[PDB]
Design an enzyme around this catalytic site. Structure first.
Site: not given
Ligand SMILES: CCCCCC[C@H]([C@@H](C)O)n1cnc2c(N)ncnc21
Ligand SMILES: [Mg+2]
Ligand SMILES: [Zn+2]
Length: 325
Positions: A228, A76, A116-117, A80
């Protein structure tokens, strides 16, 4: 700092890279020093600077402010946010969002992506609640703790002297900008996505309708979520690399949860975590539905769903003898 940025004008997109406007382009290849420039280029390419008469010096300062407003955890960080923003630009260029959304909405989405982060600490909403952080005290009861903090940080940047890219806006637009930025940033939470999912499917069932203002809402939420998660749409080198950053972060939180006597989730615990099955689970439960909804609305987003499905095949493949922990 900012005078150095605008000391040569706004570079056109093709001069950063020839394939810059394509889905195959990995924005993480661009050096971090050239990213603020790349944002200005994208904003000018989408014609958002003219449209909203954004003063260029003010835009430059805002951009640099948004950048240093990220910390340096594994995932983050500013890069990103930058790659999510680049992907939003790819959606504009390739899926032609101008036929589906108002200009001010696509503008909000892009600005939201950058912010957003903001100020992420490498931990999630559950950890904030669990560690009794001030952020949890401010936001825990309404939900989406980090998301409201991100929006709040965006606001504090927008009201810093010489960063107010909306200062001259009409009253009606300034307000819509604020509402959209909050709604779009809140949409980034898994919990939010889990709510509107039923309504997303129904939108994809009946067909998209430019006159239905709820479809705009829901489309923005889907677009944000897909920006995202866009690291899942590149080639195996990008996607496999990014998994290492994600778990690097997750494993730090897991350690901090143990030090305060909390039992971390399996994906946060490196003693329990088998990454392949975790990503496979992430791919099928969360990621692939999101891009399958994006395909159903934009047939041109077919190549994105396939590359996510492909990457999920790559996890099964390499599972044969992948690092057990
Ligand atoms: C629909 C919204 C989904 C939010 C999940 C975000 C989450 C962590 C990194 O914030 N994330 C983002 N990429 C990820 C991934 N490849 N494997 C596991 N978690 C993940
Ligand atoms: Mg976030
Ligand atoms: Zn993000």
């Amino acid at each position: 700092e900012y005078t150095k940025l605008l000391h040569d004008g706004i570079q056109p997109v093709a001069a950063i890279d020839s394939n810059f406007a394509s889905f195959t382009y990995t924005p993480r290849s661009l050096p971090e020093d050239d990213t603020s420039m790349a944002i200005l280029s994208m904003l000018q390419d989408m014609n958002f600077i003219n449209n909203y008469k954004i003063d260029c010096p003010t835009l430059a300062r805002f951009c640099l402010m948004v950048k240093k407003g990220y910390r340096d955890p594994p995932y983050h960080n500013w890069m990103h946010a930058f790659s999510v923003s680049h992907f939003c630009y790819l959606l504009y260029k390739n899926l032609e969002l101008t036929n589906y959304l108002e200009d001010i909405e696509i503008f909000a989405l892009f600005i939201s992506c950058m912010c957003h982060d903001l100020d992420h600490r490498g931990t999630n909403n559950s950890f904030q609640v669990a560690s009794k952080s001030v952020l949890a005290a401010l936001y825990s009861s309404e939900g989406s703790v980090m998301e409201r903090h991100h929006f709040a940080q965006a606001i504090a940047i927008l009201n810093t002297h010489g960063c107010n890219i909306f200062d001259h806006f009409s009253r009606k637009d300034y307000q819509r900008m604020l509402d959209l930025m909050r709604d779009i940033i809140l949409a980034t939470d898994l919990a939010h996505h889990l709510r509107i999912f039923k309504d997303l499917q129904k939108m994809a069932e009946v067909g998209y309708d430019r006159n239905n203002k709820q479809h705009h809402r829901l489309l923005l939420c889907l677009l944000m979520t897909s920006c995202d998660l866009s690291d899942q749409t590149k080639g195996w080198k990008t996607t496999r690399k990014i998994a290492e950053l994600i778990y690097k972060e997750f494993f730090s939180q897991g350690d901090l949860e143990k030090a305060m006597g909390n039992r971390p989730m399996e994906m946060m615990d490196r003693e329990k975590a088998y990454i392949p099955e975790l990503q496979i689970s992430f791919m099928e439960h969360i990621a692939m539905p999101i891009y399958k909804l994006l395909q159903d609305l934009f047939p041109k987003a077919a190549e994105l769903y396939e590359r996510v499905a492909s990457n999920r095949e790559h996890w099964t493949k390499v599972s044969h003898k992948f690092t057990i922990r």
